[PDB]
Design an enzyme around this catalytic site. Structure first.
Site, PDB file in Angstrom:
ATOM      1  N   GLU A 365       0.736  -0.881   0.052  1.00  0.00           N
ATOM      2  CA  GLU A 365      -0.095  -0.076  -0.019  1.00  0.00           C
ATOM      3  C   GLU A 365       0.963   1.472   0.128  1.00  0.00           C
ATOM      4  OE1 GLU A 365      -0.578   2.150   2.581  1.00  0.00           O
ATOM      5  OE2 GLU A 365      -2.226   3.061   2.821  1.00  0.00           O
ATOM      6  N   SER A 569     -25.342  26.807 -18.325  1.00  0.00           N
ATOM      7  CA  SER A 569     -25.693  26.815 -16.744  1.00  0.00           C
ATOM      8  C   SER A 569     -26.435  25.484 -16.169  1.00  0.00           C
ATOM      9  CB  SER A 569     -27.145  26.776 -17.750  1.00  0.00           C
ATOM     10  OG  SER A 569     -28.534  26.845 -16.629  1.00  0.00           O
ATOM     11  N   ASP A 607     -30.581  -5.635  -4.400  1.00  0.00           N
ATOM     12  CA  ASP A 607     -29.856  -5.195  -5.726  1.00  0.00           C
ATOM     13  C   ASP A 607     -29.847  -3.881  -6.951  1.00  0.00           C
ATOM     14  OD1 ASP A 607     -29.375  -7.878  -6.238  1.00  0.00           O
ATOM     15  OD2 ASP A 607     -29.762  -8.310  -7.873  1.00  0.00           O
ATOM     16  N   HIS A 630     -15.538   8.069 -10.508  1.00  0.00           N
ATOM     17  CA  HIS A 630     -17.181   8.440 -10.130  1.00  0.00           C
ATOM     18  C   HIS A 630     -16.919   9.660 -10.587  1.00  0.00           C
ATOM     19  CE1 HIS A 630     -19.687   8.472  -6.124  1.00  0.00           C
ATOM     20  NE2 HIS A 630     -19.280   7.626  -6.616  1.00  0.00           N
TER      21      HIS A 630
HETATM   22  N1  LIG Z   1      -2.991   9.329   6.148  1.00  0.00           N
HETATM   23  C1  LIG Z   1      -3.243   9.838   4.563  1.00  0.00           C
HETATM   24  C2  LIG Z   1      -2.254   7.818   4.201  1.00  0.00           C
HETATM   25  C3  LIG Z   1      -2.350   6.981   4.811  1.00  0.00           C
HETATM   26  P1  LIG Z   1      -0.529   5.409   4.304  1.00  0.00           P
HETATM   27  O1  LIG Z   1      -0.956   4.748   4.456  1.00  0.00           O
HETATM   28  O2  LIG Z   1       0.680   6.152   4.751  1.00  0.00           O
HETATM   29  C4  LIG Z   1      -0.706   6.293   2.256  1.00  0.00           C
HETATM   30  C5  LIG Z   1       0.562   6.444   1.893  1.00  0.00           C
HETATM   31  C6  LIG Z   1       0.770   5.513   0.246  1.00  0.00           C
HETATM   32  C7  LIG Z   1      -0.550   6.495  -0.175  1.00  0.00           C
HETATM   33  C8  LIG Z   1      -0.677   6.927  -2.391  1.00  0.00           C
HETATM   34  O3  LIG Z   1       0.207   6.034  -2.837  1.00  0.00           O
HETATM   35  O4  LIG Z   1      -1.437   7.039  -2.422  1.00  0.00           O
HETATM   36  C9  LIG Z   1       0.847   7.826   2.006  1.00  0.00           C
HETATM   37  O5  LIG Z   1       0.114   8.558   2.234  1.00  0.00           O
HETATM   38  O6  LIG Z   1       2.210   7.875   1.949  1.00  0.00           O
HETATM   39  C10 LIG Z   1      -4.464   8.519   4.809  1.00  0.00           C
HETATM   40  O7  LIG Z   1      -5.080   8.229   6.128  1.00  0.00           O
HETATM   41  O8  LIG Z   1      -5.552   8.690   3.799  1.00  0.00           O
HETATM   42 ZN   LIG Z   2      -1.583   3.270   5.914  1.00  0.00          ZN
HETATM   43 ZN   LIG Z   3       1.722   5.122   5.355  1.00  0.00          ZN
END
Ligand SMILES: N[C@@H](CCP(=O)(O)C[C@@H](CCC(=O)O)C(=O)O)C(=O)O
Ligand SMILES: [Zn+2]
Ligand SMILES: [Zn+2]
Ligand SMILES: *[C@@H]1O[C@H](CO)[C@@H](O[C@@H]2O[C@H](CO)[C@@H](O)[C@H](O)[C@H]2NC(C)=O)[C@H](O)[C@H]1NC(C)=O
Ligand SMILES: *[C@@H]1O[C@H](CO)[C@@H](O[C@@H]2O[C@H](CO)[C@@H](O)[C@H](O)[C@H]2NC(C)=O)[C@H](O)[C@H]1NC(C)=O
Ligand SMILES: N[C@@H](CCP(=O)(O)C[C@@H](CCC(=O)O)C(=O)O)C(=O)O
Ligand SMILES: *[C@@H]1O[C@H](CO)[C@@H](O)[C@H](O)[C@H]1NC(C)=O
Ligand SMILES: *[C@@H]1O[C@H](CO)[C@@H](O)[C@H](O)[C@H]1NC(C)=O
Ligand SMILES: *[C@@H]1O[C@H](CO)[C@@H](O)[C@H](O)[C@H]1NC(C)=O
Ligand SMILES: *[C@@H]1O[C@H](CO)[C@@H](O)[C@H](O)[C@H]1NC(C)=O
Ligand SMILES: *[C@@H]1O[C@H](CO)[C@@H](O)[C@H](O)[C@H]1NC(C)=O
Ligand SMILES: *[C@@H]1O[C@H](CO)[C@@H](O)[C@H](O)[C@H]1NC(C)=O
Ligand SMILES: [Ca+2]
Ligand SMILES: [Ca+2]
Ligand SMILES: [Cl-]
Ligand SMILES: [Cl-]
Ligand SMILES: [Zn+2]
Ligand SMILES: [Zn+2]
Lengths: 690, 690
Positions: A365, A569, A607, A630
């Site tokens: 992540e 508009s 659904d 979105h």
């Molecule tokens: N405080 C932030 C960040 C938490 P995080 O897990 O640390 C995510 C990480 C990767 C994000 C990316 O690559 O998009 C970052 O922000 O460096 C929250 O909660 O939303």
């Molecule tokens: Zn995190």
């Molecule tokens: Zn992080």
């Protein structure tokens, strides 16, 4: 009730024991320790009694420093002599060998040299001020920016657009040193020797840079690395404030333009370019991180539904950290284990959920939501047709003041209901509910008698599920008091000092606040997975659309003459919102009449509840952003951490007075108003009976 | 059975009466008569007892000749003197005033003048031969192409790419004059004075040129007309063969290269450029059609399901014609009315379908599938989550030899089943079924004991439903004998001579062949809408994928050394196909075990059957073609009327030996093999039990 059994079985001491067990060693994505932590989580889910618990791998581009070509920043004199160069584990961890040094993952390689310019937080408005008001040209300069306010990858994108040849990021005590608190280990503040790690990609939802759209399997086509999505084209490196003070001290040129540009160090905060009053002549960066395809591992487990096994509620959280990650993410890893254990205890007494629960421990992540996004790309066809909701389980405890919730309007009512039945963990609230303390501490600006719930942008693993696939999503955690606490994130974020001892001593010694978050995340999963009628309310979405339409229209008022002149508009948008409100009211009037003993009648209305969020997804994406689909929400183009409403209209109108071609610019505004009106009308159409 | 009551209630005499009533006057899209025909169809559906029958309008770009600036082609001498210029209703129609003259809708305006070049059918291979073998450069020339073999918009795209400044289209008797048949009115052949109308857009599925992606409502954003999707940039006009003979007679330059370039006129078929043996010096075109936003009207009706009202089977056919359109589309309009009447007779005795039937009479199909595509764009969110299938009802009777069916593999088994229970209308088959005569007359190349079923490309209103949305689709009609009949389409296609009298005298005097087509289209709708288990077979899709994978691999064998040198392998595609075959077999093994008295068990498996075709849809589209999303099928890039399998791979490998950059070209092949393998594996994943 079963929900009360789930919630009351969870224990603070168990969350504490899990957290200690997962935070002894660094667990960086792609490293052996984070694989060992995956297998441990897998073993635990099998013991808990989940139906499955499998490792699911992908091979994705990661980035690491080169051990034999270390990164640094230097100051050189006019004779090319190095005058200054930027440069142990926390107490108790002296024998830990493999802490990754500070770096910004995915930085370009290079050794640029030039004059230094201070650019405040490197926000869009800071670069506008530099160019349009202050007479500063960043082209060919090395810029130095303070961390804070926005995602660091946006800072790097902005510095690239301003023509910089490199960007130094640093942690100013104004933003990462809370008043009257000591630095670690005596207190929870950031020491001057520590730097914040973090990636600097601009992925806009793509996932692995080499495989946008498709999961990174062994046979998969990969872009050439030079074409990897989101990879910056200048070097980027982070430093602590002792080093930053040395670089900022002798900056010359113009004075800081106002107090909002001045941090807390004992330096002038002059802008540059160039130095005055010193041997300090030029700044150099030397950054040689390596990008390499690396295997990552998600753990994916299930409890299969007894009635609707083809309907899913996902509870997912990341496991990888920059160092020990005791807050980010491991506090959430510990919570996820305690929720799975509690669902296992229910199963041991014969319970099975109506729908299927998917548990996920995501990898990589911290390198761009990579493990959660690759799994979404692999499973998109079943996920988009079957998922009820995604509940995140990242950090549970970023401060100790009150709850923070971010979620789709579909989930507001469920969140408020469940917080009323969870004991508050706060001092002074011992016979009151979490809802009561949250309402007292963070009332909503649009209704004083409800707690604040924020919009979703990005920042964690719900992003692809919500912004690309349209699966209702939510997150909840404990946070700081925004009216008195002015620092960004928390002081030791993404440093070596996110330790178990920090959390237990300074954040939540009783683990009660973390427990309340586990109870809320687990109860949300339970109600979504077990209720006969999915517990969404679409009239709350109708009210939210009315607020967002008023907001975007209000932001257009200063251009009223141009709206008239270009025939722009908002009438169709307000008409679609009116029609949606009528359809949502009619839907709820019919929902209370459903014959609960007629399974097809129930399934048809479920659904409609499940597929409502999907109606807001446009497969054509947003301009330049194939993977943000979105129409009501997207991560802000200026700060991916923040959610923006009506993003297509907002971006079309932003800074429009400075566009070269006003006729083209206003036609783009008209396009995105038309797309938003169609999309809300189409969503209303999915609720109709005939 | 109810199906037999539906089929046996349909009558040839009723189809004949409907056809006569709808073919007395021209009914061009956007004209008053085609609106009056919509209201008539609506009145009839209400009388039949449908639950609803509504007009649904859109405002789309149409194209018509300018009455006061007529189109023509001329030949001028070197003194600018016009030497030649190209130039009543059918018997019985002498008082019809508003027959549109021949033109090609959406032609650019202009008056180009230049030397003439004959380009055969203006196929990709004809322009390759001109440039690569024959030494002909079409840049700056007016080209003349014979109609036939491929969609005319592809001819115009190819002429634009070859640098032509205008293109004349004509009907050669080789392609539109059947041997030993007299011209209309004495026989069914094309007279030399008649020209074929038709649009020359290259929309690639977009629908209205001004509103790609979104329905053309009154508030909708419209592209500037100069940016309308698919609009050609050179003039295009069609002529009959008496005029073409005059233009071709004195062409000089090289002889025709082989007999496949020679048509049937008494001219040499020399190529040009330029004339010899004549006052004939240059050719001019003068084309000034007008493009204008015009209101169109679909008629949309329903019979609501009694059990699954949120599941749809669509029966749709176009109503607009170029002139009287007695074959195209009005034979299908008459069939659709007779099917609706028969469903109404069932309802009069108390029947209601399990799922919902949607009946649709589409407008502006002849201008690019506009009415059906705009309705799909309006209703995409409900259509993609709820539709079982789309059954077309365009022309029923393009020849009188045997049946032609084109459909997804999901529907093969149902088609064969139903044709066995419909009496054959063919002379000599009076106690046999339609399946028996079809098998005798058109056996499948891949299995001699089954009738041929073709792949879907484009050409009619199923296109957006199948190629953009992934809704299983099928079509059926009577057609000519391809082994003895060498003409394209039918001789009077898109001329003033498509009259009721043509159909009754020459095609099907008893109306029995048209009746058999109505019985088959109606029975398909009935079985799809009423069966408890949706009657698709996914093992037939697995077999089809094996055939398509062998075909694309075989087409790559002549590049074997380049596959090795560039590291290109089809292994992942064959592995995905193997995995799909296993998943399809396992799915059918579980389907026979479903508890038919358990409504959720049944609904979960029906959702898997319904959503299988959707798994092949990639929201990213095909290269350059946002609106062709199916990875297994797309309209051919060389001929939109033809379906192509594995279109992304096929287009990547086509003419690859002539690409400038072989490394880039082979990487594109690898990309599309990887996308196809992922997509088939994902589709297999949607069939899995856990
Ligand atoms: N405080 C932030 C960040 C938490 P995080 O897990 O640390 C995510 C990480 C990767 C994000 C990316 O690559 O998009 C970052 O922000 O460096 C929250 O909660 O939303
Ligand atoms: Zn995190
Ligand atoms: Zn992080
Ligand atoms: C909201 O619903 C109304 C009522 O169906 C739509 O109003 C129609 O608007 C069109 C112009 O777009 C007019 O031609 C009709 O006369 C209106 N009918 C009414 C007011 O009864 C409106 O278009 C819908 N909004 C959107 C964005 O689709
Ligand atoms: C078809 O299914 C098989 C079996 O699950 C997949 O085979 C795996 O292939 C990967 C390489 O892609 C190997 O690392 C594994 O060892 C294989 N496992 C086996 C053979 O049991 C195959 O990948 C699937 N095909 C596709 C396109 O996804
Ligand atoms: N014989 C063809 C054509 C039938 P059609 O209704 O005439 C379609 C019409 C418009 C096609 C388009 O714009 O894409 C055309 O081909 O000119 C078939 O059946 O598939
Ligand atoms: C690490 O840096 C050293 C010294 O420059 C270099 O030789 C080596 O190739 C680098 N490693 C990688 C993987 O690029
Ligand atoms: C920015 O500075 C660079 C210096 O090389 C120059 O090319 C450009 O014209 C300048 N732009 C502005 C707005 O000053
Ligand atoms: C935790 O709460 C205590 C008691 O209010 C407070 O003194 C301390 O600063 C808080 N810790 C953090 C990290 O905010
Ligand atoms: C039709 O042609 C006439 C003569 O050129 C021209 O005056 C008129 O504007 C044309 N109509 C349209 C709608 O362009
Ligand atoms: C095509 O002919 C045009 C004549 O203007 C010329 O520009 C071009 O070079 C020629 N190309 C070939 C392949 O002959
Ligand atoms: C119709 O069938 C008859 C009898 O086989 C044949 O003579 C005639 O040519 C056919 N008509 C057409 C239009 O093919
Ligand atoms: Ca990917
Ligand atoms: Ca459109
Ligand atoms: Cl979270
Ligand atoms: Cl048809
Ligand atoms: Zn036609
Ligand atoms: Zn037709």
């Amino acid at each position: 009730s079963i929900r009360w059994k789930l919630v009351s079985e969870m224990k603070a001491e168990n969350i504490k024991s899990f957290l200690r067990s997962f935070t002894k060693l660094p667990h960086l994505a792609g490293t052996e320790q984070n694989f060992l932590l995956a297998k441990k989580i897998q073993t635990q889910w099998k013991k808990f009694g989940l139906d499955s618990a499998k490792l699911v791998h992908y091979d994705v581009l990661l980035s690491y420093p080169n051990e034999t070509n270390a990164n640094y920043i230097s100051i050189v004199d006019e004779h090319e002599t190095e005058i200054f160069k930027t440069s142990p584990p926390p107490d108790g961890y002296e024998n830990v060998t493999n802490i990754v040094p500070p770096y910004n993952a995915f930085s370009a390689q290079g050794m640029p040299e030039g004059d230094l310019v201070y650019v405040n937080y490197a926000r869009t408005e800071d670069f506008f001020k530099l160019e349009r008001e202050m007479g500063i040209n960043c082209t060919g300069k090395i810029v130095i920016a303070r961390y804070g306010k926005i995602f660091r990858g946006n800072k790097v994108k902005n510095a690239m657009l301003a023509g910089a040849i490199g960007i130094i990021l640093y942690s100013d005590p104004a933003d990462y040193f809370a008043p009257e608190v000591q630095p670690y280990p005596k207190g929870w503040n950031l020491p001057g020797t520590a730097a914040q790690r973090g990636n600097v990609l601009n992925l806009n939802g793509a996932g692995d840079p080499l495989t946008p759209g498709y999961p990174a399997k062994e046979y998969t086509f990969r872009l050439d690395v030079e074409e990897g999505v989101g990879i910056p084209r200048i070097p980027v490196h982070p430093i602590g404030y002792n080093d930053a003070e040395i670089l900022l001290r002798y900056l010359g040129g113009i004075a800081p333009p106002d107090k909002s540009w001045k941090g807390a160090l004992n330096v002038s905060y002059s802008i540059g370019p160039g130095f005055t009053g010193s041997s300090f002549r030029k700044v150099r960066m030397h950054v040689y991180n390596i990008n390499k395809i690396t295997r990552i591992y998600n753990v994916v487990g299930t409890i299969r539904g007894s009635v609707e096994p083809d309907r899913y509620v996902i509870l997912g959280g990341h496991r990888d950290s920059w160092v020990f990650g005791a807050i980010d993410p491991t506090s959430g890893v510990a919570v996820l284990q305690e929720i799975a254990r509690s669902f296992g205890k229910l199963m041991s007494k014969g319970w099975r959920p109506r729908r299927t629960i998917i548990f996920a421990s995501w990898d990589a992540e911290e390198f761009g939501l990579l493990g959660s996004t690759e799994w979404a790309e692999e499973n998109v066809k079943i996920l988009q047709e079957r998922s009820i909701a995604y509940i995140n389980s990242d950090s549970s405890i970023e401060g100790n003041y009150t709850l923070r919730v971010d979620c789709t309007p579909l989930l507001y009512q469920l969140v408020y209901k469940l917080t009323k039945e969870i004991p508050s963990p706060d001092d002074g609230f011992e016979s009151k509910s979490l809802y009561e303390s949250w309402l007292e501490k963070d009332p909503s600006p649009e209704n004083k008698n409800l707690p604040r719930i924020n919009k979703l942008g990005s920042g964690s693993d719900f992003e692809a599920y919500f912004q690309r696939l349209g699966i209702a999503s939510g997150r909840a955690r404990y946070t700081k008091n925004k009216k008195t606490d002015k620092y960004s994130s928390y002081p030791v974020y993404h440093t070596i000092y996110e330790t178990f001892e920090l959390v237990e001593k300074f954040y939540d010694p009783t683990f009660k606040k973390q427990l309340s978050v586990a109870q809320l995340r687990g109860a949300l999963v339970y109600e979504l997975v077990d209720s006969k009628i999915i517990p969404f309310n679409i009239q709350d979405y109708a009210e939210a659309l009315k607020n967002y339409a008023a907001s975007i229209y209000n932001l257009s008022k200063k251009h009223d003459q141009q709206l008239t002149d270009h025939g722009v508009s908002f009438d169709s948008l307000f008409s679609a919102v009116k029609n949606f409100s009528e359809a949502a009211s009619d839907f709820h009037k019919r929902l209370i009449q459903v014959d609960l003993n007629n399974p097809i009648a129930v399934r048809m209305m479920n659904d409609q509840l499940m597929l409502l969020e999907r109606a807001f997804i446009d497969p054509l994406g947003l301009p330049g952003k194939l993977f943000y689909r979105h129409i009501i929400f997207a991560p802000s183009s200026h700060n991916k951490y923040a959610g923006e409403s009506f993003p297509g209209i907002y971006d079309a109108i932003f800074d429009i007075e400075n566009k070269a071609n006003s006729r083209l610019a206003w036609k783009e505004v008209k396009k995105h108003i038309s797309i938003a009106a169609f999309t809300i009308q189409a969503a209303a159409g999915t609720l109709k009976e005939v």
